[PDB]
Design a protein around this ligand. Structure first.
Ligand SMILES: [Mg+2]
Ligand SMILES: [Zn+2]
Ligand SMILES: [Zn+2]
Lengths: 50, 1151, 99, 148, 49, 89
């Protein structure tokens, strides 16, 4: 049912929607969505649980 | 006579939109430069945010350049740099301006959700903004071609439409467009069309919005405002002194953020001028215009948008849209029991510093000082004479005392200063109740009544002795507190056998003489001859004497009791309640002065005999029941019995839980009523015989019984076990605390106790804020309500009967009718006999006469039914005050009502304080009961979809009324029986709106008062019905018109205004065109929203919206209310100033 | 603490302790209600006008206090005047009518 | 199947209360603004308040709120509208610069030639130089120098 | 609150349905919050911060 | 000192008008145009005025009559002075 409420289709589309959610009002970019999403919870710099 | 021009004492105030020229009127120069000061010689740069030429000299009577420095040259405008030499204070006055290159929207009017430009133009917000930022074109006066007037276009669309029609078609974009729109708009024509269109098509949706808009339009027209002024041409600049650049230590400066903002506005505007003269391409000048709009918007109200930040500081700069009192002091307080009720100990140094000007004045008045300077030097030296001078200035000059949590008016009381050596303020013990002031380090503040009127106001109103009674209820607030009542209790009391038991004495004199010599015990059964008086003769004291069977102590105490009081009052055991009723009766009999001095003597003797009594508290004074351990054992049998039952499955889990909890809960009561009996009567002593037993002389019992301090619950917690405790979850543990405080509490018991402690602390700390908030809403809903007329002369009132709840008399009739005026003459069981004629204030004697006869009910005039418009007549209100006399003309009763309702609110815990809140707020309950809409036989119609419709059948009338009642809710009404209007068609709580509409005004006014009084009386709190009745009066203030002939159909309007207009319309005018209405219940917070004065509303409501909404209407605030006059800083239109405001109000609107 | 006449704030003229000589006690809204409940207007006016916010009223009073004349010539509190200027600084025209 | 803003409204009304967080996400993807909320809490609050006690009038507090829902694109913040407005203008070609500059030259030379064909424009310069050598003016305030 | 994963309910008050609700929250020592939460329609959701 | 104004209130019933009138009288004495109607016990003009209210020899009626008389007391003085101002003709 969650998938049924999902407006996206592929990886890139989801990344665009996420980037647009985080930083709205401004045009998305492939490198920007990838950079952002990878820099959120997957970066050794911007993320630590210790 | 020529009216006036120059400054007089002004009336009212007006607010409206500003014209460009009107703005230029205030402005004494245009600020053309962002510069402030020269950076070396800190003098202001000419024509800049800080300027001497435009605004004012930097120093008093001194030109900038320094040409004319003399106090002689004044109206001179200097030739070098034009500056009129005048006080520097006019740099705090004179305004300025800026001429904007391009028009700019005023952000308050643009976005303040009545977007005013928008709903004036009937144009949506997003279109207006899309135009303002040059994101699209908008047509203006499109003529007869292809297009609507308010229609918006785009680039291509505009180009095309322009190619098709060169002229007779017009469009612009940006601020200029909105301005042209507004300017072109003709209100008259629009009105003329709206009226016709209103008249033609019949639909709710259509003519509702239609009539609303035409009303708005004609309002705007009568306002005098013109639409263009919503768009800024000239931008006024605030005087420099109100946004200071003033220096500091270390050479550093500090300044308001308005300078940063104004600087931004000026810079961008100038850059726009240049870009206009340089003929920049549109892409640039548009951006500059948008930046200017942003700058101005941020300058006015920075709340909206993106909130520009100040230089080098993250914090957003505070925009334009974004009391300490002299002659005062404070300190820690002490007792000073030696004080009379009318005075307070004032520290020497404090009184010296406070009255300093008075001391100077007196010192050079008698000639002890050459001049004021010499006086200063004298008191600064503290020469020995000045003290005596101080004693002169202190004598008849009262001071004001105040505590921190001020609730009821008694929170501030005036006393007479008595010089004290020390730094602490001595406060009379009997007042400690009114202040809610303990001696654990609470601090109090002092104020000095400077003006003569302030001294006399302090003495005749705010004085301690002038207020002996709670404004909430007639009961004395000067009631002795603790030590004193234990004194009179230990004094007035008897044991079975003592010294001088049974002997006889001539009078109290030799009774005390017998006691003080150690011959006779203070408490001993003795017959003595006393002379008691009575004023029962007409205005005259009758004397009588007899042999009374009393105690030595009571006889001694009788020496204090004044005149006409019976001996019977001191012949009891003298508890706190009896010691209160003593003072009360003394007041309602002998008058004020005797009550005062009596109260004093009572305190002194109380403390004295309490001191002599040698009353203490030891560890052996708290007696644990001998049978405690046994009760514990037995209940502990019960718990394992039920445990064994759960083990055998005879009982369920929840059932077991409830059973065990019940048996422990009973055990608690058992032990309690063991220790209570044991601590009560256990003293067994002998008089001439074997034995006998009486009330114990044990200390802690005396304390708890007398009412000094402690209570059966707390004593229970000391001796018997304490309660069962509950987790934060609120589930109650089935293993109660069997140990008490006298015994040791083991680790667990204490730890489980801790939660209760902290939830206690936290909850109390919260209910403080709740009570305060409630008081605030309450004073906001009442306030301006003040006794205005004297007697309205209405027969109308409410029927007063005793409450008679369940069993006998949860509250008597005498209390409810006391101090209240009769609506109409009531009768004996037999008639043609008028006991209480018509309207007469029912005082003690009268109520007693009603009590003599069997009278079961009295009709009483109330504030809710009073015919007086815009206030209450004294005749209807009642009596209660600090004085037993009827309420004065001009006393502000709304304030004291709210105060009296909110002050006890700390002691309140559906139920509780939030229940009171819900009541006053008129809120519909969660699962309400629905009353019968109309009388007559009813039936259940249709079937199940969301509701099962109930169809009513009135006997004579039609049956258009069918109410759809959801059927999943169990009904009550009999489908085969008739039901009167306002019957129960279901159970559950009932919305007060329903009670008002279906049942009546008096019905709902009774519902509120009875419900809130249930809440308070359940907690043991005395609040007279009066106050709540005034709050109710305020609640029902509005109404909604039904018929017509004068005003509009659905308009919510004042019952005062309405009734005034129909009572005026019943005669003259149309023979009677008078319109019907329907009274409406408004919650207190909603009724508070309605106020005529905008200055008042701008206070507690949301300021921006209020100021705007008033400004567009050109609303004229006539003052007339409390709050607004407080803000504007003039005499309150009530109390002492009531005469002033009266006189003036009459001089105004007249010859 | 005690104060008769001390220093004053620049922005709005109100009693402010600068010397460790303390500023006056704050008279709050609830206190204003207390004075309102009593019939004392003059005590309140002098409280929030002459004793505090009126730059003229304070000195004009002091001279009377030392002269042996207890009166007040209140005038308009500086706070409301500042508010007049602040409101009027916007596109809002606020006027004082009649006579 | 669609229309967004009704649902946060219609629910917010049926529950009687909505958390400050409840409206934020339930808001359409259109209006995300921070200071947006500031006045709309007052809007919903006068008609059925939850700021986490009001006016029972409602009515126009919905029609205007829907007017705020249609007003939800352009986020204002003039940096944006500018960046976008200028983002339209096409980049110059190396030759296009020469085209435009040539056009400039044609224009300015046109106005200069138009000046030179005016007799008074000559006579004025003559009289002005007559004022220069008469010490009634200076050489710097007449000519910036000739071609040279 | 310790860094890690946390499972809460928000039973009762949410949408006054008595249907309760369930949410998990990943709180890092330093970084963005990863929230997962249900709704009355039983549709799982995710919000960053 | 005057501890209880009950009697002063008894005379003039309004009790605010008590404060107003007594203020007026206390002013007549404080900045001296006049002198007490009752022996001064060293009581300040406040209390003296209140006492004067108690003894019923002072109230709004009386004060107004006295002042209205004084208007003519001064009017009888300037009678020649102001009639000398016929220069207005
Ligand atoms: Mg305390
Ligand atoms: Zn000069
Ligand atoms: Zn009445």
């Amino acid at each position: 049912e969650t998938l049924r409420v999902d407006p996206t289709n592929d990886r890139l589309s989801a990344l665009v929607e996420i980037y647009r959610m985080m930083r709205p009002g401004e045009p998305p970019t492939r490198e920007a969505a990838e950079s952002l999403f990878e820099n959120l919870f997957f970066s050794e710099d911007r993320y630590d649980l210790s | 006579l020529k009216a006036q021009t120059k400054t007089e004492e002004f009336d009212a105030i007006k607010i409206a939109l500003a014209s460009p020229d009107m703005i230029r009127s205030w402005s004494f120069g245009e600020v053309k430069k962002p510069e402030t000061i020269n950076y070396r010689t800190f003098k202001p740069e000419r024509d800049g945010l800080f300027c001497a030429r435009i605004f004012g000299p930097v120093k008093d009577y001194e030109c900038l350049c320094g040409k004319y420095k003399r106090l002689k040259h004044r109206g001179v405008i200097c030739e070098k740099c034009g500056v009129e030499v005048t006080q520097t204070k006019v740099r705090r006055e004179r305004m300025g301006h800026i001429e904007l290159a391009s028009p700019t929207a005023h952000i308050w009017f643009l976005k303040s959700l009545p977007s005013r430009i928008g709903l004036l133009l009937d144009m949506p917000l997003r279109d207006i903004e899309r135009v303002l930022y040059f994101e699209s074109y908008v047509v203006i006066e499109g003529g007869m071609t292809n297009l609507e007037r308010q229609q918006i276009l785009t680039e291509e669309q505009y180009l095309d439409a322009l190619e098709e029609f060169g002229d007779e078609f017009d469009a612009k974009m940006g601020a200029e467009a909105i301005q042209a729109l507004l300017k072109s708009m003709d209100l008259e024509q629009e009105c003329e069309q709206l009226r016709e269109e209103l008249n033609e098509t019949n639909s709710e949706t259509k003519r509702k919005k239609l009539t609303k808009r035409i009303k708005l339009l004609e309002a705007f027209v009568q306002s005098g405002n013109k639409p263009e002024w919503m768009i800024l041409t000239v931008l006024p600049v605030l005087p420099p002194d109100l946004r200071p650049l003033v220096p500091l230590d270390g050479g550093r400066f500090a300044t308001s953020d308005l300078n940063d903002l104004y600087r931004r506005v000026i810079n961008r505007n100038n850059r726009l001028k240049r870009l206009l003269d340089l003929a920049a391409p549109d892409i640039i000048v548009r951006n500059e215009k948008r930046m200017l709009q942003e700058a101005v918007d941020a300058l006015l109200d920075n709340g909206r948008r993106g909130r520009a930040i100040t230089g080098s500081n993250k914090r957003p700069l505070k925009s334009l849209a974004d009391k300490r009192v002299d002659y005062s002091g404070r300190s820690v307080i002490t007792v000073g029991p030696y004080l009379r009720l009318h005075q307070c100990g004032l520290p020497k140094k404090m009184a010296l510093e406070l009255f300093k000007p008075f001391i100077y004045g007196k010192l050079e008045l008698r000639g002890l000082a050459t001049t004021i300077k010499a006086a200063k030097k004298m008191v600064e030296r503290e020469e020995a004479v000045v003290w005596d001078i101080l004693d002169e200035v202190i004598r008849e000059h009262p001071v004001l005392l105040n505590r921190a949590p001020t609730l009821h008016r008694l929170g501030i009381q005036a006393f007479e200063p008595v010089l004290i050596e020390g730094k602490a303020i001595q406060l009379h013990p009997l007042v400690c109740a009114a202040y809610n002031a303990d001696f654990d380090g609470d601090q109090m503040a002092v104020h000095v009544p400077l003006t003569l009127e302030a001294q006399l106001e302090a003495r005749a109103l705010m004085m301690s002795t002038n207020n002996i009674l709670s404004p909430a209820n007639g009961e004395p607030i000067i009631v002795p507190s603790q030590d004193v009542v234990l004194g009179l209790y230990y004094m007035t009391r008897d044991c079975v056998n003592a010294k001088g038991e049974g002997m006889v004495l001539t009078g109290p004199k030799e009774a005390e003489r017998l006691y003080r010599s150690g011959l006779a015990s203070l408490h001993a059964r003795v017959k003595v001859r006393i002379t008691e008086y009575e004023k029962d003769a007409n205005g005259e004291l009758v004397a009588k004497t007899s042999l009374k069977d009393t105690t030595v102590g009571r006889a001694i105490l009788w020496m204090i009791v004044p005149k006409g009081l019976p001996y019977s009052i001191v012949n009891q055991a003298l508890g706190k309640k009896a010691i209160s009723k003593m003072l009360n009766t003394c007041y309602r009999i002998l008058g004020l002065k005797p009550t005062v001095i009596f109260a004093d003597q009572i305190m002194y003797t109380g403390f004295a005999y309490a001191a002599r009594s040698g009353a203490s508290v030891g560890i052996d004074d708290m007696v644990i029941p001998e049978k405690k351990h046994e009760i514990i054992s037995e209940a502990e049998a019960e718990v394992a019995e039920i445990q064994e039952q759960f083990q055998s499955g005879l009982v369920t889990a929840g059932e077991r839980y409830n059973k065990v909890i019940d048996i422990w809960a009973a055990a608690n009561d058992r032990v309690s009523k063991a220790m209570m009996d044991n601590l009560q009567t256990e003293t067994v002593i002998n008089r001439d015989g074997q034995e006998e037993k009486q009330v114990s002389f044990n200390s802690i019992y005396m304390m708890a019984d007398s009412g000094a301090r402690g209570s059966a619950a707390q004593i229970r917690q000391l001796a018997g076990m304490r309660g069962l405790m509950a987790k934060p979850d609120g589930s109650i543990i089935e293993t109660p605390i069997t140990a008490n405080f006298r015994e040791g509490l083991n680790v667990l018991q204490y730890f489980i106790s801790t939660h209760g402690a902290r939830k206690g602390l936290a909850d109390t700390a919260l209910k403080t804020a709740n009570s305060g908030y409630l008081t605030r809403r309450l004073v906001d809903v009442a306030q301006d309500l003040v006794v205005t007329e004297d007697d309205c002369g209405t027969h109308e009132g409410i029927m007063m009967t005793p409450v008679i709840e369940g069993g006998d008399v949860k509250e008597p009739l005498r209390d409810r009718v006391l101090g209240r005026v009769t609506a109409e003459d009531v009768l004996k069981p037999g008639t043609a006999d008028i006991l209480v004629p018509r309207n007469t204030l029912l005082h003690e004697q009268w109520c007693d006469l009603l009590e003599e006869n069997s009278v079961d009910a009295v009709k009483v005039r109330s504030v809710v039914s009073c015919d007086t418009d815009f206030g209450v007549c004294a005749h209807c209100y009642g009596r209660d005050l600090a004085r037993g006399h009827i309420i004065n003309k001009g006393e502000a009763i709304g304030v004291i009502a709210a105060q009296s309702i909110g002050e006890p609110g700390t002691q309140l815990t559906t139920g509780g304080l939030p229940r009171v809140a819900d009541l006053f707020e008129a809120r519909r309950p969660k699962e309400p009961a629905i009353l019968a809409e109309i009388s007559g036989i009813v039936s259940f119609g249709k079937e199940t979809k969301g509701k099962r419709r109930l169809v009513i059948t009135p006997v004579d009338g039609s049956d258009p009324y069918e109410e759809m009642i959801p059927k999943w809710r169990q009904l009550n009404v009999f489908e085969g029986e008739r039901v009167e209007r306002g019957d129960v068609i279901s159970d559950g709580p009932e919305a007060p709106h329903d009670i008002l509409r279906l049942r009546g005004v008096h019905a709902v006014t009774r519902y509120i008062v009875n419900e809130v009084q249930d809440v308070y009386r359940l907690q043991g709190v005395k609040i007279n019905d009066k106050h709540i009745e005034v709050i109710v009066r305020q609640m029902l203030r509005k109404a909604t018109i039904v018929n017509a002939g004068s005003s509009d159909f659905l308009e919510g309007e004042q019952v005062e205004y309405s009734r005034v207009k129909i009572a005026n319309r019943e005669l003259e005018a149309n023979g009677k065109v008078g319109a019907t209405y329907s009274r409406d219940l408004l919650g207190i917070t909603k009724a508070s929203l309605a106020t005529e004065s905008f200055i008042s509303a701008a206070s507690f409501q949301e300021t921006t919206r209020v100021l705007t909404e008033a400004a567009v209407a050109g609303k004229r605030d006539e003052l007339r209310g409390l709050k607004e006059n407080v803000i504007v800083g003039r005499l309150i239109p009530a109390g002492t100033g009531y005469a002033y405001h009266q006189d003036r109000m009459r001089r105004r609107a007249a010859g | 603490h005690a104060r008769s006449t001390g220093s004053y704030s620049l922005v709005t003229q109100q009693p402010l302790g600068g010397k460790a000589q303390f500023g006056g006690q704050r008279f709050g809204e609830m206190e204003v209600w207390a004075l309102e409940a009593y019939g004392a207007a003059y005590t309140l006016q002098e409280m929030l006008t002459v004793k505090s916010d009126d730059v003229n009223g304070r000195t004009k009073m002091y001279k009377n206090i030392v002269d042996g004349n207890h009166q007040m010539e209140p005038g308009m509190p500086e706070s409301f005047n500042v508010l007049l200027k602040e409101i009027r600084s916007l596109g809002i025209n606020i006027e004082l009518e009649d006579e | 199947p669609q229309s967004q803003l009704k649902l946060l409204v219609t629910r917010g009304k049926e529950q009687g209360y909505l958390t400050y967080a409840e409206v934020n996400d339930h808001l359409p993807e259109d209006i995300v603004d921070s200071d947006q909320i500031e006045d709309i809490i007052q809007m919903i609050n006068d008609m059925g308040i939850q700021v986490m006690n009001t006016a029972d009038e409602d009515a126009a507090e919905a029609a205007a709120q829907v007017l705020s829902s249609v007003e939800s694109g352009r986020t204002t913040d003039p940096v944006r509208m500018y960046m976008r407005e200028m983002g339209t203008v096409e980049l110059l070609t190396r030759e296009g610069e020469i085209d435009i500059a040539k056009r400039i030259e044609d224009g300015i030379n046109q106005v200069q030639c138009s000046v030179a064909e005016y007799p008074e424009a000559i006579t004025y310069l003559l009289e002005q130089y007559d004022r220069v050598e008469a010490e009634e003016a200076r050489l710097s305030d007449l000519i910036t120098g000739f071609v040279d | 609150r310790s860094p890690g994963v946390f499972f809460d309910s928000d039973k009762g008050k949410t949408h006054s349905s008595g249907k309760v609700l369930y949410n998990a929250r990943i709180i890092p020592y330093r970084g963005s919050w990863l929230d997962f939460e249900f709704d009355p329609k039983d549709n799982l959701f995710v919000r960053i911060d | 000192a005057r501890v209880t104004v009950q009697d002063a209130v008894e005379k003039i019933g309004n009790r605010f008008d008590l404060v107003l009138v007594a203020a007026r009288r206390a002013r007549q004495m404080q900045v001296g145009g006049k002198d007490p109607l009752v022996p001064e016990e060293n009581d300040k003009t406040t209390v003296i005025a209140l006492r004067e209210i108690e003894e019923g020899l002072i109230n709004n009626q009386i004060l107004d009559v006295r002042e209205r008389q004084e208007q003519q007391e001064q009017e009888a003085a300037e009678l020649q002075a102001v009639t000398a101002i016929a220069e207005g003709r």
